[PDB]
Amino acid sequence: IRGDEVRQIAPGQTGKIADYNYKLPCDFTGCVIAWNSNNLDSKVGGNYN
Amino acid sequence: WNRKRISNCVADYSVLYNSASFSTFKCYGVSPTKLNDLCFTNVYADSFV
């Protein structure tokens, strides 16, 4: 995902991706791991995949 | 801060929330996705920088 949408991936959160793309339950047991990848997910000229 | 009043009109809150021009859009007492289905006695838009 895009950088400061990272906190949209959380229980009971709203935004573009938290409601249209990936919705967690309120009673979500488990946890979220995020790391920046500007190396193999980014390319000059833009990665549109 | 300048206070503009809004009353006696039809408010479209979807255009503002769906616009990506805003750094943060965070709401207390309401959920923005449902703002289009509410009726308000009065609205006050207080703007500043």
Q: What are phi and psi of A18, to 5 degrees?
A: -75, -15
Residues 4-43 of A with CB under 8 A from B: 14, 16, 19
Q: Which of A2, A8, A14, A23 to mutate to test the interface with B (most CBs of B within 10 A)?
A: A14
Instruction: Report yes or no: B3 and B45 within 8 Å, Cβ to Cβ.
Output: yes
Provide the experimental method for this PDB entry.
Answer: cryo-EM
Q: Which residues of B touch A19 (CB under 8 A)?
A: 33
Which residue from A minimizes the CA distance to B19?
A: A16
Which residue from A minimizes the CA distance to B31?
A: A14
Buried residues in A9-18 as b, exposed as e (16+ CB within 10 A): beeeebbeeb
Instruction: Report yes or no: B42 and B7 within 8 Å, Cβ to Cβ.
Output: yes
- Tell me the resolution in Å: 3.0
Burial class (CB in 10 A: 0-12, 13-18, 19+), B13: middle
SS (HEC) of chain A: CCHHHHHHCCCCCCCCHHHHCCCCCCCCCCCCCCCCCCCCCCCCCCCCC
Q: CA separation (Å) from B2 to B5, B10, B43, B46, B47?
A: 10, 22, 14, 5, 5
Q: Which residues pair with B2 in a beta bridge?
A: B47
